[PDB]
Symmetry: C5
Subunit: 273 residues, 5 copies
């Protein structure tokens, strides 16, 4: 038996409280309707998956032996923190929800809620897609994010295929704040050594629906009673928690809002062949 | 136990990234309110079911034996991929969700959500229906789609019957991207060797509600512990996943949007009476 | 010992046949306005009704005088609303456009009130009558095209406000297809001891319709003592009503209800009873 | 050994009888305006109330002084709201039309607040008082048409803001039908040991009413020790309240609450007690 | 070290927790709005200082249980173990009111219709533990201006983390130093403090949130359900010092002012009934 705790901070676009965008950590950069067509869509405008690898106590001195020991993740407790902050109606720079001569409340955080968490023994497998195959993305050296066609490398005239399923558009979630949610999803064709759980509610004004409790556990064992086996004695957790949007007052454009997620994974030892 | 994996790409109307409509693959053609009355409704304006038959390993050397082996589908995992892409508020040509002089976001994908998947040992049985019996449909040779009255062959003065249940309007889901969702539904009076599961949320602005996970399975065994029996060593898989609509900015017409679905079907060998 | 029974029930939303002047709106209701029943007489074609049918089962007993008889017992059923995919249409005929007045957008889809109920019993489903407005004016026909609670209760005109509560005399059996309007009749929970009914309702004019369809789900009809509905006279009685929303006309924004057909598959067994 | 009990509870939305001047709006409330209770005295007919009734059961004991006595024990119940189909009406008398000003569209259907609760017990249901506005003005008549929390707590006027929280003195028994308003009284969870109540609430003015009806479902009334409500005095007490939405008037856009009758079927058995 | 249960070994506890939406007492100038928050405007906290009365807070209370051990230096002692509890929000029916004082009218400009009912954000949580509930701090806006009084009427996450002004944007993520214990009624704002899942090993909390300004409130109430407080090992919270700690917060929606369309939060009281048993422990 053993237990592992850690926090995953949100990666909505502004992924660090530094630089010019310092004051909007935990948010995305402002997004307009023609972005990606009038201009190049920035990394800071695309909410990304969070990820982390935890080094577990190394179990095998000689890895050449036929019978080895491995950490097996049996269950997990996970929770999104800071949900109470979403009741705010005094949001900075946010649009007022009232008539022209009023002094009413600001728009609260509302809209798209995308929530996923994953526990596995190796990086999460991702499948790429594009809502618009010809969306213009900015490029920097080094790269601040990675998009499906950076791997599939289809000709520019063939990028409409990315609106369906491109088998070459696959990747591993091997870097935090690097894979945009709107382009990558957990790959159901793989992820045999991982468990992921996701839900999505669209719309711009949809009421956010979130729960939080410390009395619920997610069992990670499969039908055979075997959970994720941590290769290299590494535990891989990943998440994504878009909780809604903020509506700017001046031009009504939006930023996504994310919240931190907590993990407590319970592991046992298993002998493998 | 053997597992079979495959993807079913969406057939919303623009069913291939080729031609003039190449850039809107995975979407439908633009739809206006008077389409089908002011003109002929196009096949690219009607989302259709996706289907595929998978050839399984041949099991029998002689089909006249009283006892034969058949592949039995016992369970399945299925998932709609690309759900995170539905958060986009920078959609091409989409209507802006803000005031007249603003520079706000675009409408995200929202509206009708029609999600169904099916696993069987033979093509899925379909039942035809029309919301408007007198809807005008375009015709090409060869046909790009098939409609209920193409089989029922009712006189034009009797097509209002298709707004109810016309028993002669039956078909098998035997062609990918051919049977429109708005005209064909899984036939509950048949499909004894298939299992289908469907859900529908209407409206044009409804927030889409979707889930994705790899820790959930659907048991395909019936009350007698028998799953679909693959006739001719063929596993038949069907789906249709309308995830909402995109609203044009210039004239506010809509395109349906669909997403690919994945299948992992678990099968075993069963001996049956012949 | 065992038998299965299949049948369809076509919707009875008002226009109950693809014949006559209203032929093209079979499966819909007649157009309804806010003052109908007040400035004019409300028509039966404007009132969705329950669908019902009696299925003749194989005869079980020869001498009906015998002390011990045999009855068919419905144990389970599968039921499904077919044609749900047609509700995605945004090109509905004569429908209001869902966009700015100077656009060329889609039509309003079928949305709004969803009233879904099905029933299986050994006798006609017992109904209880009610009125949302006691003084609603209903058209009169001989023979009648529909029946209303006061046709049975027969209260004086000045006492019809009682029908907005519960009038015990306002009771009937669902004994005629396309005859008992939904807005006036409900399953009677004070009876129906030999029937099983399951119903749900979601109101509003713009509510998104929420419907499911599958063939891997059954409904067990046995009660807490393991007894299902016993078919009297060797007759199986099925009932249903499936309002899936409304259509909004473009010219004056009035509405029509819309329904879809429902399928039944009931499994029955033989059961001995005392006469 | 075992008995069954049936009874109907008619709604007490304000107009609590099909007699008098407000005869035609039985089953509804009186019209409610925003400034009512401030511009005037709020009427009892403007406040939906709980229904209740005591059902006399067969007498069991010839001497209430014996150490061992028999009592009726309610083990399970079947309850249903009737008339749900009537909520589809879009031709409500005097109701606001939901269409453009030049149109001839349908009326507003019944929608908005849904407050549904039923209770079964061996004695009157215990209630706890509250006020959303402590200084609400209530009309007075002799005999009283309803009762309010401060009629029992008897706080001075300048301290009535306490009733916007928890005032322990504002307690009462549901001992009179069409007498205790819903907006002032809730079931008291600090008591009601000999009762079972089940309630739900969806607010707002335009929320779609969501209701179900079936005769295949029962509610078990036993507690964790397998004991149900014991009927003191051989009397069974049932209570309810079923606000199903509001009607909006066309002329001033004010509202009436609308309720529906509720049916009860309670199964009882004989139990010996000390 | 938890041992076995001792089989007068049980007891029951009841109490009410009144809402602390900001106006936390029916006294003073804000007396008439007890159970509500103070009026809130969009630019509050930016062009002025946000007040304690404008920030709904958690309710909490300690219940003194019967003393179990006379000699606290004994090797084997006994503690109260909370096994289950019933909890209920009272006054839910009051939320049907459409004649709310000073509330905006929901009708056309020349009409006389109903007021807006209570609707909007719903935040409902309750917690039962053997010690104060652990809290984790956060800020929706890092630079929100908060009014300060001596003594303080509420506490904010940066009062503990003590970050410099140019680093308060970290409070929009997870600042580990911003932790506290729910040890004071009407003092910890809901919009800044959440139950800390990295701690609270001796507490059980259950919460849900539905946002938006016009969302229909959805609440239930019944006396026929219990919440089992035992963990996976069959051990409920152990009450250190024979003290039972109950916490809650029940924002049920907002009231919209008619004159300027600004809002007040509204809360309702919550009831608790905790069942406890005697559990042996090793000191
Ligand atoms: Mg695989
Ligand atoms: Mg069949
Ligand atoms: Mg009866
Ligand atoms: Mg008590
Ligand atoms: Mg810990």
């Amino acid at each position: 038996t053993t237990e592992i705790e850690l926090w995953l901070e949100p990666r909505m676009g502004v992924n660090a409280p530094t630089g010019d965008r310092k004051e909007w950590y935990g948010y995305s950069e402002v997004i307009h309707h023609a972005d990606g067509y009038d201009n190049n869509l920035l990394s800071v405008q695309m909410p990304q998956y969070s990820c982390a690898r935890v080094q577990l106590p190394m179990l095998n001195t000689d890895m050449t032996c036929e019978t080895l020991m491995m950490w097996e993740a049996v269950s997990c407790k996970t929770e999104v923190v800071g949900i109470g902050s979403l009741i705010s109606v005094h949001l900075l720079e946010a649009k007022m929800e009232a008539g022209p001569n009023s002094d009413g409340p600001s728009r609260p955080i509302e809209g798209m809620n995308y929530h996923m968490f994953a526990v596995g023994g190796e990086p999460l497998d991702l499948q790429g897609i594009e809502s618009n195959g010809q969306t213009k993305y900015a490029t920097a050296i080094p790269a601040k994010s990675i998009h499906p066609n950076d791997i599939a490398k289809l000709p520019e005239e063939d990028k409409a295929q990315l609106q369906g399923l491109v088998p070459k558009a696959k990747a591993k979630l091997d870097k935090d704040g690097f894979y945009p949610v709107e382009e990558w999803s957990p790959d159901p064709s793989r992820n045999e050594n991982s468990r992921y759980y996701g839900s999505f509610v669209g719309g711009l004004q949809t009421p956010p629906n979130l729960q939080f409790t410390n009395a619920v556990s997610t069992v990670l064992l499969d039908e055979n009673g075997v959970g994720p086996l941590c290769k290299g004695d590494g535990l891989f957790v990943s998440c994504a928690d878009i909780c809604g949007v903020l509506v700017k007052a001046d031009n009504e454009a939006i930023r996504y809002r994310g919240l931190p997620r907590y993990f407590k994974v319970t592991l046992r030892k298993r002998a493998v062949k």
